Amino acid sequence: MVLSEGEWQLVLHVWAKVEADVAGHGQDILIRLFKSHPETLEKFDRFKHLKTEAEMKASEDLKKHGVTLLTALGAILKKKGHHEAELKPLAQSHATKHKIPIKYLEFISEAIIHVLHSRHPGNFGADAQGAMNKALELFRKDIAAKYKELGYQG
């Protein structure tokens, strides 16, 4: 698939707001993911033991990882579809080391869209949400193709 420049502008316009607070957004997103789909928490051996949202909010480690996660995603969105190089090491570690099924990348895509919608209503109307969804679907499709080449397709 291919996004138009107008769709990329709607995606990078709301992403510029997310970047004003990367650690806060990283925390909200991971907590929304773990609450909504608790089975995903099991994949993080580092966080597995967190029982409540209050423990999640207070974990400095969790917040550090949320910044690592969003910084990598941001670098991929800013490529505007030319992300082949960025996608390689990410597809290799998530398929071979972490073992993250495509379904879980769909679940965190849902969490990203929920959080931007709650925090940035003015910059995340229907058209901006359709463009962000297209951008994350492109990301998932390309990662899924690489997972296949790597021998995982999960």
Residue numbers at the binding site for ligand HEM (CB under 6 A): 40, 43-44, 46, 65, 68-69, 72-73, 90, 93-94, 98, 100, 104-105, 108
HSE of 15, CA atoms in CB hemisphere, 13 A: 22
Distance CA 41, CA 48 (A): 6
Local structure of residue 80 (DSSP, 8 states): T
HSE of 74, CA atoms in CB hemisphere, 13 A: 19
Q: How far is the CB of 140 from ligand HEM (least distance, A)?
A: 9
Q: How far is the CB of 118 from ligand HEM (least distance, A)?
A: 18
Q: Which is nearer to ligand HEM, 8 or 104 (CB)?
A: 104
Q: How far is the CB of 93 from ligand HEM (least distance, A)?
A: 3
Count helices and strands in the chain by DSSP H and E runs? 7, 0
* C-alpha closest to that of 25 among 100, 123, 112: 112
94 is in an annotated binding site: yes
Q: Which is nearer to ligand HEM, 38 or 122 (CB)?
A: 38
117 is in an annotated binding site: no
Q: Which is nearer to ligand HEM, 98 or 148 (CB)?
A: 98
Residue 121 corresponds to which amino acid? P
Residue 103 corresponds to which amino acid? K
Q: How far is the CB of 44 from ligand HEM (least distance, A)?
A: 5
Q: Which is nearer to ligand HEM, 89 or 122 (CB)?
A: 89
Tokens representing residue 36 in the block? 């909504």
Q: Which residues are annotated as a binding site?
A: 65, 94
Q: Which residues are annotated as a binding site for O2?
A: 65
Q: Which residues are annotated as a binding site for heme b?
A: 94
